[PDB]
Design a protein around this ligand. Structure first.
Ligand SMILES: Nc1ncnc2c1ncn2[C@@H]1O[C@H](COP(=O)(O)OP(=O)(O)OP(=O)(O)O)[C@@H](O)[C@H]1O
Ligand SMILES: Nc1ncnc2c1ncn2[C@@H]1O[C@H](COP(=O)(O)OP(=O)(O)OP(=O)(O)O)[C@@H](O)[C@H]1O
Ligand SMILES: Nc1ncnc2c1ncn2[C@@H]1O[C@H](COP(=O)(O)OP(=O)(O)OP(=O)(O)O)[C@@H](O)[C@H]1O
Ligand SMILES: Nc1ncnc2c1ncn2[C@@H]1O[C@H](COP(=O)(O)OP(=O)(O)OP(=O)(O)O)[C@@H](O)[C@H]1O
Lengths: 292, 361, 348, 145, 209, 134, 344
C-alpha cells in the first residue's frame, strides 16, 4: 500500500493509516439531497421511467434478480436539446434512491498534468466500492468522449482515453457492476459505438422538445409559488408553446414573476405567456420592408 | 525617516519575540480525521501531517480542507490561516479601477429598461420584495453592435450601494498548455461566495474569437472545459450564489451558455446603438468638453453620419480640438460655421475613402 | 548617528532574502524564501507596505527569518529593457521631403508632454499614438520620425519585444506594471516595430505549437486590447498587416489614425541625401543631379551606399583623397543601373 | 572531540576578556576551526583539554595493540612469488612508461617547459620492492638453521 | 583520483559480442553492397598506411533510410559475422533519462571506444526521435538529448582527420533531421537502401526456401 | 496480475467464428506444448497477434479467458498506464513489460485501446505527443 | 593542504553565479542545480566591484564570495560557429579572387578608415548577398567569411540552440545584432535557409523573409538613426532565391557578386588546390579533366577526387591515373536531372 507513517530518522512504521489517496483527487464533492423532485416534469412520463427503472430496480429487487439471474443496468445516457431539465431531474432521482450523490462532470476529470483523468476515475470507484451502492452523475460526456477522426491531438484526449478506460473497467472489472453511474450529454452527434453494454451505456433516452401539454405542466409546477393574475385558461399558453425548450419555458416563468408591481410596462393578462415565447425567435419588424 | 528610525529601535522588542512565530511554516491542507484529537494534514513537503492541536485553538476551528499553521518544535497546530488570493493569471483578471462610464449618453430606449428592472432596481428592493419570488434570475446578457456595451456597468457602480462589484474578463483564460481554466473558475467562485452580495462580471469572448484556430485542434473540446464547468459551477446548489452573476458578450456565440441560462439567467438585450436624438445628447455632454457654446446646430450633420455610436463622434469632437490648436482657435461658435467644416471632412475620412463616380456607375 | 551602527548586526551578516507571499490585516507578514517557506513577522513601522504589493522580495534576518525592513530592488526583467536609452543625436529635421507626412505624426505626439496648456483645457485629448508601415523595406524609416520622440522624455525601442513569443508573463499587467513604475518617471513612449509573431510562416521549429502558439499569441492579442487601457504608455505599432488585431481591440484603442510611407520621389531623394551630407561636408566633384535623376522611386538609404560601393573599390586603388578616377567609376555605377527592379513584367 | 563552556550573556556590562595564563588560551584559539564554530563563540568560550598520565595502561595500550597487530603471533605470517610476478610487472611495465619522460626531457633543444623531475616516486618503490623480496627470501635461511 | 576512465553507467556497451545475431547468408549484398561497404565501412577499421597515400578522407558517415525493406540493423549484424567487432546497440529514444548530467558522459564514453580500440562500429536506429527540435523549456530533457546528438556531431569533427572512428546510422524519417547532421564535412557518404521491388523478391524467396 | 475472469468455458461459449476459435487455440497453446514442430521443420512460430474491434464481440472475452486460465503466466496492460504521470517515464515500463515477458514463458500481453497511446508523429501536439513517440 | 582542505571540508567550497548586484550591500548568488540565493559582505570583493553575469567561489559557511572567476560567453557561441565553419585561407578556394577583390573594403574600411567615407561624404553599406544556381560556395562562402573578415560567424537558424543560449529566444532583430556589437569588425551571415523543402517558395522565401526584413531594416538604421558601424549581412544562395534576392538587393547596396557556376578557370584553380593533399602522377593534364566535366560544381570536383581515390585505393597503388578520374566522372553522370518523359 501507501500512506504508512515513517518518523524522522527512526524509519519505523507504527501503524498503517487510511484512507486511500490522494489530496483533492480523493473527494470530489460531498452532496446530500436535492430540493426538487421527479414530479416537476410532464410529458416525459414514459421516457423518464426508463431512467427511473434502471436506477431503482437494483436497490430493492436485487434479491429478486439473484433468483432470475438478471443483471441491473449501469451506464445510462440522458440527452436532448437544452433546456431538457436533465441537470436537476437526474439529480432529483438521488433523493428517491436514498443513495449518496456525488457531483462529477467532464471538465472535472481534466487537470493540468498528464494521466490525471485515469487517476480520478479509479479514485471514485475506490470510494464507490467502500461507500456502498451510490449515484454518480456526470454532464456532457460527448465533449470528452469525442474521438474525432485523425490525431494528434485532442486537448481532452487524456479523458477520451479515460472514458474508454471506464469502458475497460466496465469490461474486465467485475466490481464495477456496483454503484451505478448516471451520464448525460447535450448532443449525440459524437457517440462511441463501444458504449453498448449493461455496464456501459444501456438505457439511452432521446428527449425531444416537450409537448404543448407537457410544456404547460412543467411551467405550471414552476409558477405555482408565484402570485399570478387570475383568469388563466391554460388553453392559449399551451398551444402558443411549440418547439420551445424547457429552459425557454422557465425564461417565460422567470418573466412571469416580474409582472406584479408595475412592471412598469403593461402586461395586463393572458398575453404574458405569448410575450417571452416570441422573444427568442420573433418579432418582425420585417416581414415585408425592403422586400416584397 | 521618523518611521525608519523608530522601526530600527522597535525591532529590539521584536528580537524578544524572535523565536516564536518562526515555526509558522508551512501552509498545509488537512485531509481526514482518525479521532477527535488527531487529524491528518497534507503539507508542502509532500507527506501527510498527523497532528494534535495547541490549547490556543479549539478543535472546531480545524475542518477538512483548511490551511493551518504549526509549531515545528512541539509539532502541534499553531493558528489556521484561511487567506490566499489567486494564481498569477487570475490576479490580473481581477478588476482595477472603473472605466467606460455611461454618463456620456442617456437615456436609452429599451435595453436600459430591460435589464434595470430585472436586476438593478430590485437590488435596493422597492420591487423584488413584493414582486418576487421566485428567487430572481442570477444574470443578464449584453451583446449587439460594439456601441454600446459594458458601459452600463461603470455607471451602475455609482448607483450601487456599498460595495462596488469586481468585474472579470473572459479573454485571459488562455496562457499556456491546457487545464488552467479548471482550477480558475473553481477558486474564483469560492471567493465569490465569500464576496457576500458582490457581483461578478464576465465579457470579452470576441477578443479571443478573431481567428484563434486554423484547422485543428481547436478550440472546441478544450473550450468545453471552461464553458461547461462555468455553467456546471453556475448550476451549483449552494448558495447560490447570493452574489448573482453578470454576463456579457459581443456576438451571440456561443449557443451552449445561451440555452442553459434561461432556466436561471434571463433578459437578453440587443444594442442600441444610438438614435437621432441620441447622438445630439452625446454632443450635449461634449459641450462641457472642448470649448463649446449652445449656438451650434447638432442635428444638421448628425443625420448624415448614422451608425457612428458614441465612439466615432467622440473622435470627431477629439480631432476637432486637434485642428483648433493647429488653427489657434478656441470656442466652437467662433468657428460657428467652420466647426462643421472640420466635422464633415474628418468623419467621412475615418469611415473610408471610395470614389463616388463608380458607385452610380 | 548610532542608529546605523547599532542595527547593522541585527539583520546580518550572512542574511538571506526571500519573497513576500501575502499580507495579513493582523500585522503578521508571511515571507517565502525559495522554495516553499513561511513565517510570521510583526512590524508596525517602516512600511511602505502599500508601495510593496505582494509577490515582491523582502529581507529576512537570520534570527529568526524576520524582516528588518523592506526595499525596492530589481524590478523584474521587463523594466530593464526600457534602457538604454535611446534619445540619439538625430532629430526629425535630419530627414526631409516627408515634412508634409511627418507633420501629422510629429504634432500628434507633441500634443501631450510639451504644449500641455491647450491639451488640458480641451478635456476630451487623442493620446492614441499612430501606426506605421510602408514599402519596400521601410517602416523603420518611420521610426526615424520617432527619433525626435526618442529624445522626448523616456523612449522604448521594441522589435518583436521579448516575452511575447518567447515566454509569457502574467496577464496584461506587464505593460501596466510598467505604467505604475513609469507614473513616477513619466511621460514615456513604447514603440512597436516589425512584429515577427505572425510574420513567420513556419515557426522554429516544431513546438507546442502549431495550434497553441496561436493561443499564446492570442494572449498578446488580449494583452493589447486592453484591460483596462487608460493613459500612456504611448503605443506606436509598425508591421506589415494590421488585420491581426480583432475589432474588439480597437474599441479601447487606438482609433486615431495610421500612416503609410510612400516611395520618396526625386525631390525627397535629394533632400534626404542633402541633410545627411549637410552637417558632414560632402565632395564637390560628385553632383546630386545625376544620382536622383538616374533612379526612380528609391529610399534615401539606397542613394547613399551606391556612392559607398564606388568608394568601396576606390580604396583598392589606395586613395583617401578625392580623385577623379572614382568619378568615372561612380558614373560607371550610374551606367551600371540595377538600382530598382519589380514585376511587371508586362506591356500595359 | 570538542569542548565548550557557556559564558553568561548578562556579563555584557562587564568585561568579556578573561582569563590569565595566555599560553593555553592562544593555542586553543588556533587553528580557529573553520568559521561557524567561532561564530558560536558568542555566549560561549572553549576550554583546553590535556591528558593526565595513563602511562600505566597507556604502555600496555601500545603493547596490546602492536603485539596482536604483528603477524598475529609475530610468528604466523612467516602473494609471495605470485606477487613478485605482479611486482616485476610494476618493476618493468611501469618502468618503460616512466623512462619515456627522460626521452621527453631531451627536446632537443629546448622547446618544452623545464625543469621537470620524473625520478620519484617509483624509483624508491623499486628499492623497497627488492628489499621486500630479498628479506622475504631470507625467511628460508632464517627459519631453517 | 579520476577514473581510468571507463564507460561509467551509460549505455551499457558491448552485449553484441554474446553471439549469434543474424547470419549474413540471407542478404550480405554480395559483390554489389559488399563493395561500397568494403571501402567506406570495414576498411576505415584501420587501413592507416593506405589513406596517407591517396590523401582522400574515408569519412565515418553511413546513412540508411526508407524502410521497407528493413536492412539497417541487419547490415550491422552482417558485418558482425564477417569480422569480430564490438557494436553499440541503442535507439534514439532510450537514453533519455531523469538526469541530463549523464549526457556529456554518454557521447564521450560511446565515442572513446572507437578511437582507442577499433574493432568498433556504432549503430543508432531511428534518430528522428531526438532529431525533433522542441523549443519549450519543460521539454529541455528533449532539448538536452538533441544537444547530446549534436555533441557527438561535434565529436565526429574532433576525429577527422583522421584515425579513427566508424559510425553507421539509420532512421525512418529524414525530414526531421537537423541540417547540420547531413551537412558536408561530417557525413560525406550516404547510401540509400533501395526499395526491394521485384529484384529482392526472388532473393528473399531463395533464402526463405 | 490483479485481474480475473471466469472461463475456461467462455472460450467455446461465443460460438464464432469457428475458424477463429480453433486458430487462437493453436498459435497460443501449440508453441507451449510442442516446440518440436518449429525446430524440426525449421519455421519461426508467430510471436505476436492483433485482435481489433468492435465488428462484433469476443476481443476481451476470448483472449482474457485463456489469460485467466493460464493462471500465474500472463501480463496485462491498460492504456491508462502508458501516459503515467507528469514528467513520468513509461519508456522503462515498455522495456520492463517485455523483460518480464522474456522471464515467464510463454508470456501473453494484452494492449487495449491504443488509439490514444499509439500516437503518430505526423501531427505532434503540444509537449505531450513526443512522450507518446518515446 | 590539510589545513586548506579543512576550509573546503565541511560543506565543500561551491561556485556561485552573480545575476545582479544590489545597493543594499547584498550580492545575489546563483548555484547551478539550486535557485538564486543572496549574501551580504563579503568585504573582500567590494560592492561596486561586483558585476552581473560573473562566476564567484561560494564559501561553505556564510555562503560568501571566496574568489572570482571569469565567464566565457563567446566560446560557446563560437563553438556552434566553428562546428559549422572551417578556416579556408585565401588559397583554399578558387573563383573567389574577384570576390575578395572588391569585398575587402566592405570589411576593413569602416574600421581603420572612417575618414575616406567623408571624402565622398558617405556612410557604410548594410550588407551584401550572392545569387545563382549551384555551383559551389554554399559551404565555401561561409568558409571564407571567418578567415577573411575575422568576425563572429553568428548564423541563421540554426535549429534549436540559436535561440536558447542568447536570452530566452532569438528574435534575430536584436540579440544577433547585439552580439554583433560585442565584436567590433563583425558581419552577419545566414546559412543555409536555402534548399528544396520548401521548393514551393512558401517555407523557402517565408523563413528567409525574416532575414529579408532584417536586411531591409538595417538599411533604415544607418539612414535615420544609429551609433554603430560595421554592421552588415551576407547571404548564401543554393536553389532559386535568385529573383527573391534581386527584388530586395539588386546589387543594392553593395558590390554585385553572382554565386559562381562551375567554370573553366573556376575548375582549374579549385582542382589544383585540393590536389596538394594527395599523391598524383605528373603525366596527368589538368586542363582536359576540367573540360570533361560540364556543369556539376566545384564541390563535384572534390567528389571526383574522392571517387578517383577509391578505385586507386582498390588497385593498391600510391598514385591515381587520369583514366581513373574518367571513372570518377562516369559515376556522377548517371544522377543528372531526369528524362525522357514530359519534355521529349
Ligand atoms: N422538461 C422540463 N421539465 C421541468 N423542468 C425543466 C424542463 N426543462 C428545463 N427545466 C428547468 O430549466 C432549468 C434549467 O436547466 P436546463 O434544462 O438548462 O439544464 P439541462 O439542459 O438539463 O442541462 P444538460 O443539458 O447539461 O443536462 C432547470 O432548473 C430545470 O428545472
Ligand atoms: N457473446 C457474449 N456472451 C456473453 N457476454 C458477452 C458477449 N459479448 C459481450 N459480452 C459482455 O460484454 C463485455 C465486453 O465484451 P467484448 O469486449 O467482447 O465486447 P465489446 O468490445 O465491449 O463490444 P462493444 O465494443 O461493441 O461494446 C464482457 O464483459 C462480456 O461480459
Ligand atoms: N452608443 C454610444 N453612445 C455614447 N457613447 C458611447 C457609445 N458607444 C461607446 N461610447 C463611448 O465610447 C467609450 C469607450 O467605450 P468602449 O470602446 O470601452 O466600449 P466596449 O466596452 O468596448 O463595448 P463592448 O463591451 O460592447 O465591446 C465609452 O466611454 C463610451 O462613452
Ligand atoms: N534476407 C533478408 N532480406 C530482407 N529482410 C530480411 C532478411 N532476413 C531477415 N529479414 C527481416 O529483417 C527483420 C529484422 O531486421 P531489423 O532488426 O533490421 O528490422 P528493422 O529494420 O528494425 O525493422 P523496421 O524497418 O520496421 O524498423 C526480420 O523481421 C526479418 O523479417
Amino acid at each position: 500500500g501507501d500512506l504508512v507513517g515513517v518518523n524522522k530518522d527512526s524509519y519505523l512504521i507504527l501503524e498503517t493509516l487510511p484512507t486511500e489517496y490522494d489530496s483533492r483527487v480523493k473527494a470530489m464533492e460531498v452532496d446530500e439531497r436535492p430540493t426538487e423532485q421527479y414530479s416537476d416534469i410532464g410529458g416525459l412520463d414514459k421516457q423518464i421511467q426508463e431512467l427511473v427503472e434502471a436506477i431503482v430496480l437494483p436497490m430493492n429487487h436485487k434479491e429478486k434478480f439473484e433468483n432470475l439471474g438478471i443483471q441491473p443496468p449501469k451506464g445510462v445516457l440522458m440527452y436532448g436539446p437544452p433546456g431538457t431539465g436533465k441537470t436537476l431531474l437526474a439529480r432529483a432521482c438521488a433523493a428517491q434512491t436514498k443513495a449518496t450523490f456525488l457531483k462529477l462532470a467532464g471538465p472535472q476529470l481534466v487537470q493540468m498534468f498528464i494521466g490525471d483523468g485515469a487517476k480520478l476515475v479509479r479514485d471514485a470507484f475506490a470510494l464507490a466500492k467502500e461507500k456502498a451502492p451510490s449515484i454518480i452523475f456526470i454532464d456532457e460526456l460527448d465533449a470528452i468522449g469525442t474521438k474525432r477522426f485523425d490525431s494528434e491531438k485532442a486537448g481532452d484526449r487524456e479523458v477520451q482515453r479515460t472514458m474508454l478506460e471506464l469502458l475497460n473497467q466496465l469490461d474486465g472489472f467485475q466490481p464495477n457492476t456496483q454503484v451505478k453511474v448516471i451520464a448525460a450529454t447535450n448532443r449525440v452527434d459524437i457517440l462511441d459505438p463501444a458504449l453498448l453494454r449493461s455496464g456501459r451505456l444501456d438505457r439511452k433516452i432521446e428527449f425531444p422538445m416537450p409537448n404543448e401539454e407537457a410544456r404547460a405542466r412543467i411551467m405550471q409546477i414552476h409558477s405555482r409559488k408565484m402570485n399570478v393574475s387570475p383568469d388563466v385558461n391554460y388553453e392559449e399558453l399551451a398551444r402558443c408553446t411549440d418547439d420551445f425548450n424547457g429552459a425557454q419555458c422557465k425564461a417565460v416563468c422567470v418573466e412571469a414573476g416580474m409582472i406584479a408591481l408595475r412592471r412598469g410596462a403593461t402586461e395586463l393578462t393572458h398575453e404574458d405567456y405569448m410575450e417571452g415565447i416570441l422573444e427568442v425567435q420573433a418579432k418582425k419588424k420585417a416581414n415585408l420592408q425592403y422586400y416584397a | 525617516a521618523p518611521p525608519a528610525l523608530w522601526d530600527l529601535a522597535a525591532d529590539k522588542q521584536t528580537l524578544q519575540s524572535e523565536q516564536p512565530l518562526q515555526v509558522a511554516r508551512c501552509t498545509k491542507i488537512i485531509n481526514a480525521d482518525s479521532e477527535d484529537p488527531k487529524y491528518i494534514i497534507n503539507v508542502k513537503q509532500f507527506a501527510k501531517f498527523v497532528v494534535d492541536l495547541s490549547d490556543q485553538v479549539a478543535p472546531t476551528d480545524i475542518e477538512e480542507g483548511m490551511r493551518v499553521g504549526v509549531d515545528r518544535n512541539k509539532y502541534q497546530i499553531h493558528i489556521p490561516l484561511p487567506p490566499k488570493i489567486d494564481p498569477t493569471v487570475t490576479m490580473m483578471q481581477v478588476e482595477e479601477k472603473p472605466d467606460v462610464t455611461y454618463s456620456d449618453v442617456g437615456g436609452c430606449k429599451e435595453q436600459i429598461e430591460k435589464l434595470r428592472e430585472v436586476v438593478e432596481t430590485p437590488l435596493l428592493h422597492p420591487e423584488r420584495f413584493v414582486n418576487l419570488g421566485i428567487e430572481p434570475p442570477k444574470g443578464v446578457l449584453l451583446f449587439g453592435p460594439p456601441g454600446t456595451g459594458k458601459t452600463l456597468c461603470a455607471r451602475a457602480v455609482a448607483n450601487r450601494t456599498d460595495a462596488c462589484f469586481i468585474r472579470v474578463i473572459g479573454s485571459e483564460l488562455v496562457q499556456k498548455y491546457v487545464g488552467e481554466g479548471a482550477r480558475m473558475v473553481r477558486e474564483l467562485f469560492e471567493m465569490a461566495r465569500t464576496k457576500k452580495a458582490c457581483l461578478i462580471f464576465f465579457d470579452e469572448i470576441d477578443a479571443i474569437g478573431g481567428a484563434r484556430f486554423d484547422d485543428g485542434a481547436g478550440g472546441d473540446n478544450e473550450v468545453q472545459r471552461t464553458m461547461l464547468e462555468l455553467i456546471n459551477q453556475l448550476d451549483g446548489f449552494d448558495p447560490r450564489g447570493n452574489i448573482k452573476v453578470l454576463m456579457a458578450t459581443n456576438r451571440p456565440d456561443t449557443l451552449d451558455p445561451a440555452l442553459m441560462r434561461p432556466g436561471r439567467l434571463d433578459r437578453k438585450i440587443e444594442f442600441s446603438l444610438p438614435d437621432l436624438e441620441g447622438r445630439t445628447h452625446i454632443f450635449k455632454i461634449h459641450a462641457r468638453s472642448m470649448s463649446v457654446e449652445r449656438d451650434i446646430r447638432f442635428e444638421l450633420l448628425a443625420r448624415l453620419c448614422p451608425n457612428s455610436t458614441g465612439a466615432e463622434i467622440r473622435s470627431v469632437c477629439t480631432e476637432a480640438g486637434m485642428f483648433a490648436i493647429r488653427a489657434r482657435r478656441k470656442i466652437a461658435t467662433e468657428k460657428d460655421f467652420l466647426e462643421a467644416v472640420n466635422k464633415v471632412i474628418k468623419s467621412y475620412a475615418k469611415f473610408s475613402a471610395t470614389p463616388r463616380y463608380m458607385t452610380y456607375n | 548617528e548610532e542608529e546605523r551602527s547599532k542595527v547593522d548586526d541585527l539583520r546580518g551578516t550572512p542574511m538571506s532574502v526571500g519573497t513576500l507571499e501575502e499580507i495579513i490585516d493582523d500585522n503578521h507578514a508571511i515571507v517565502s524564501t525559495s522554495v516553499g517557506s513561511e513565517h510570521y513577522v510583526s512590524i508596525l513601522s517602516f512600511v511602505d507596505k502599500d508601495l510593496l504589493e505582494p509577490g515582491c522580495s523582502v529581507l529576512l534576518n537570520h534570527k529568526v527569518h524576520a524582516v528588518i525592513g523592506v526595499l525596492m530592488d530589481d524590478t523584474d526583467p521587463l523594466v530593464t529593457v526600457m534602457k538604454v536609452e535611446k534619445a540619439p543625436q538625430e532629430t526629425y529635421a535630419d530627414i526631409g521631403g516627408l515634412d508634409n507626412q511627418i507633420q501629422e505624426i510629429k504634432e500628434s505626439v507633441e500634443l501631450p508632454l510639451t504644449h500641455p496648456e491647450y491639451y488640458e483645457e480641451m478635456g476630451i485629448k487623442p493620446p492614441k499614438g499612430v501606426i506605421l508601415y510602408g514599402p519596400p523595406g521601410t517602416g523603420k524609416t518611420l521610426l526615424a520620425k520617432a527619433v525626435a520622440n526618442q529624445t522626448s522624455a523616456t523612449f522604448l525601442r521594441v522589435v518583436g519585444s521579448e516575452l511575447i513569443q518567447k515566454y509569457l508573463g502574467d496577464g496584461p499587467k506587464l505593460v501596466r506594471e510598467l505604467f505604475r513604475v513609469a507614473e513616477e518617471h513619466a511621460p514615456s513612449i513604447v514603440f512597436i516595430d516589425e512584429i515577427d509573431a505572425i510574420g513567420t510562416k513556419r515557426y522554429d521549429s516544431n513546438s507546442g505549437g502549431e495550434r497553441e502558439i496561436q493561443r499564446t499569441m492570442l494572449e498578446l492579442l488580449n494583452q493589447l486590447d486592453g484591460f483596462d487601457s487608460r493613459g500612456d504608455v504611448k503605443v506606436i505599432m509598425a508591421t506589415n498587416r494590421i488585420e491581426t488585431l480583432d475589432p474588439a481591440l480597437i474599441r479601447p484603442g487606438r482609433i486615431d489614425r495610421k500612416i503609410e510611407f510612400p516611395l520618396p520621389d526625386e525631390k525627397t531623394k535629394k533632400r534626404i541625401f542633402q541633410i545627411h551630407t549637410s552637417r558632414m561636408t560632402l565632395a564637390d566633384d560628385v553632383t546630386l543631379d545625376d544620382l536622383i535623376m538616374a533612379k526612380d522611386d528609391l529610399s534615401g538609404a539606397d542613394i547613399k551606399a551606391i556612392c559607398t560601393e564606388a568608394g568601396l573599390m576606390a580604396l583598392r586603388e589606395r586613395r583617401m583623397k578625392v580623385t577623379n578616377e572614382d568619378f568615372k567609376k561612380s558614373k560607371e555605377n550610374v551606367l551600371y543601373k540595377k538600382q530598382e527592379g519589380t514585376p511587371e513584367g508586362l506591356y500595359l | 572531540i570538542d569542548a565548550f563552556r557557556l559564558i553568561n550573556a548578562n556579563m555584557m556590562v562587564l568585561g568579556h576578556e578573561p582569563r590569565q595564563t595566555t599560553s593555553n588560551l592562544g593555542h586553543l584559539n588556533k587553528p580557529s576551526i573553520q568559521a561557524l564554530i567561532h561564530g558560536l563563540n558568542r555566549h560561549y568560550y572553549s576550554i583546553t583539554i590535556n591528558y593526565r598520565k595513563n602511562e600505566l595502561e597507556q604502555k600496555m595500550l601500545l603493547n596490546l595493540h602492536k603485539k596482536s597487530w604483528m603477524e598475529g603471533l609475530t610468528l604466523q605470517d612467516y602473494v609471495v612469488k605470485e606477487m613478485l610476478e605482479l611486482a616485476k610487472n610494476y618493476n618493468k611495465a611501469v618502468e618503460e612508461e616512466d623512462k619515456m619522460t627522460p626521452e621527453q626531457l631531451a627536446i632537443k633543444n629546448v622547446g618544452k617547459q623545464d625543469p621537470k623531475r620524473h625520478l620519484e616516486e617509483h624509483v624508491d618503490v623499486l628499492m623497497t620492492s627488492n628489499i621486500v623480496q630479498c628479506l622475504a627470501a631470507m625467511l628460508d635461511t632464517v627459519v631453517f638453521k | 583520483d579520476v577514473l581510468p576512465p571507463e564507460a561509467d553507467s551509460s549505455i551499457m556497451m558491448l552485449t553484441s559480442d554474446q553471439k549469434p545475431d543474424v547470419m549474413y547468408a540471407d542478404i550480405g549484398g554480395m559483390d554489389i553492397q559488399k563493395q561500397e561497404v568494403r571501402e567506406a565501412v570495414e576498411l576505415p577499421l584501420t587501413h592507416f598506411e593506405l589513406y596517407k597515400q591517396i590523401g582522400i578522407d574515408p569519412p565515418r558517415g553511413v546513412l540508411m533510410y526508407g524502410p521497407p525493406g528493413c536492412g539497417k540493423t541487419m547490415l550491422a549484424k552482417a558485418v558482425a559475422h564477417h569480422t569480430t567487432a564490438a557494436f553499440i546497440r541503442v535507439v534514439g529514444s532510450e537514453f533519455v533519462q531523469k538526469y541530463l548530467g549523464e549526457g556529456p558522459r554518454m557521447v564521450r564514453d560511446v565515442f572513446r571506444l572507437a578511437k582507442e580500440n577499433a574493432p568498433a562500429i556504432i549503430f543508432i536506429d531511428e534518430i528522428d526521435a531526438i532529431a525533433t527540435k522542441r523549443f519549450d523549456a519543460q521539454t529541455g530533457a528533449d532539448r538536452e538529448v538533441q544537444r547530446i546528438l549534436l555533441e557527438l556531431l561535434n565529436q565526429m569533427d574532433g576525429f577527422d582527420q583522421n584515425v579513427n572512428v566508424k559510425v553507421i546510422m539509420a532512421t525512418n524519417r529524414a525530414d526531421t533531421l537537423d541540417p547540420a547532421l547531413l551537412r558536408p564535412g561530417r557525413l560525406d557518404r550516404k547510401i540509400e537502401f533501395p526499395l526491394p521491388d521485384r529484384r529482392q523478391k526472388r532473393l528473399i524467396f531463395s533464402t526463405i526456401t | 496480475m490483479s485481474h480475473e475472469d471466469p472461463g475456461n468455458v467462455s472460450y467455446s461459449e461465443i460460438g464464432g467464428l469457428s475458424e477463429q476459435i480453433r486458430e487462437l487455440r493453436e498459435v497460443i497453446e501449440l508453441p507451449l506444448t510442442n516446440p518440436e514442430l518449429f525446430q524440426r521443420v525449421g519455421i519461426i512460430p508467430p510471436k505476436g497477434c492483433l485482435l481489433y474491434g468492435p465488428p462484433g464481440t469476443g476481443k476481451t472475452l476470448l483472449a482474457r479467458a485463456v489469460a485467466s486460465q493460464l493462471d500465474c503466466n500472463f501480463l496485462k496492460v491498460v492504456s491508462s498506464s502508458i501516459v503515467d504521470k507528469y514528467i513520468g517515464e513509461s519508456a522503462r515500463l515498455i522495456r520492463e513489460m517485455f523483460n518480464y515477458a522474456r522471464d515467464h514463458q510463454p508470456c501473453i500481453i494484452f494492449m487495449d485501446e491504443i488509439d490514444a497511446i499509439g500516437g503518430r508523429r505526423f501531427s505532434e501536439g503540444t509537449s505531450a505527443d513526443r512522450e507518446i513517440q518515446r | 593542504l590539510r589545513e586548506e582542505l579543512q576550509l573546503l571540508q565541511e560543506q565543500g567550497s561551491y561556485v556561485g553565479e552573480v545575476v545582479r548586484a544590489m545597493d543594499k550591500k547584498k550580492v545575489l548568488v546563483k548555484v547551478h542545480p539550486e535557485g538564486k540565493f543572496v549574501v551580504d559582505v563579503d568585504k573582500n570583493i567590494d560592492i561596486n566591484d561586483v558585476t552581473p553575469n560573473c562566476r564567484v567561489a561560494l564559501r561553505n559557511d556564510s555562503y560568501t564570495l571566496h574568489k572570482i572567476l571569469p565567464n566565457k560567453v563567446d566560446p560557446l557561441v563560437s563553438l556552434m560557429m566553428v562546428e559549422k565553419v572551417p578556416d579556408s585561407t585565401y588559397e583554399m578556394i578558387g573563383g573567389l579572387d574577384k570576390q575578395i577583390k572588391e569585398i575587402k573594403e566592405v570589411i576593413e574600411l569602416p574600421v581603420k578608415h572612417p575618414e575616406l567615407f567623408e571624402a565622398l561624404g558617405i556612410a557604410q553599406p548594410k550588407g551584401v548577398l550572392l545569387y545563382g544556381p549551384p555551383g559551389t560556395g554554399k559551404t565555401l562562402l561561409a568558409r571564407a567569411v571567418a578567415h577573411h573578415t575575422d568576425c563572429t560567424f553568428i548564423r541563421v537558424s540554426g535549429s534549436e540552440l540559436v535561440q536558447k543560449f542568447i536570452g530566452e529566444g532569438a528574435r534575430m532583430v536584436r540579440e544577433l545584432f547585439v552580439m554583433a556589437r560585442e565584436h567590433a569588425p563583425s558581419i552577419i551571415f545566414m546559412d543555409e535557409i536555402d534548399s528544396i523543402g520548401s521548393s514551393r517558395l512558401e517555407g523557402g522565401s517565408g523563413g528567409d523573409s525574416e532575414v529579408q526584413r532584417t536586411m531591409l531594416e538595417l538599411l533604415n538604421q544607418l539612414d535615420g538613426f544609429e551609433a554603430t558601424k560595421n554592421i552588415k549581412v551576407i547571404m548564401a544562395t543554393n536553389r532559386i532565391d535568385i529573383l527573391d534576392s534581386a527584388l530586395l538587393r539588386p546589387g543594392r547596396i553593395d558590390r554585385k557578386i553572382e554565386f559562381p557556376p562551375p567554370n573553366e578557370e573556376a575548375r582549374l584553380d579549385i582542382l589544383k588546390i585540393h590536389s596538394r593533399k594527395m599523391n598524383l602522377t605528373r603525366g596527368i593534364n589538368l586542363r582536359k579533366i576540367a573540360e570533361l566535366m560540364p556543369g556539376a560544381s566545384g564541390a563535384e570536383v572534390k567528389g571526383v577526387c574522392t571517387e578517383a581515390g577509391m578505385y586507386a585505393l582498390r588497385e593498391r597503388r600510391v598514385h591515381v591515373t587520369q583514366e581513373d578520374f574518367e571513372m570518377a566522372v562516369a559515376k556522377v553522370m548517371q544522377k543528372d536531372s531526369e528524362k525522357n518523359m514530359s519534355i521529349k
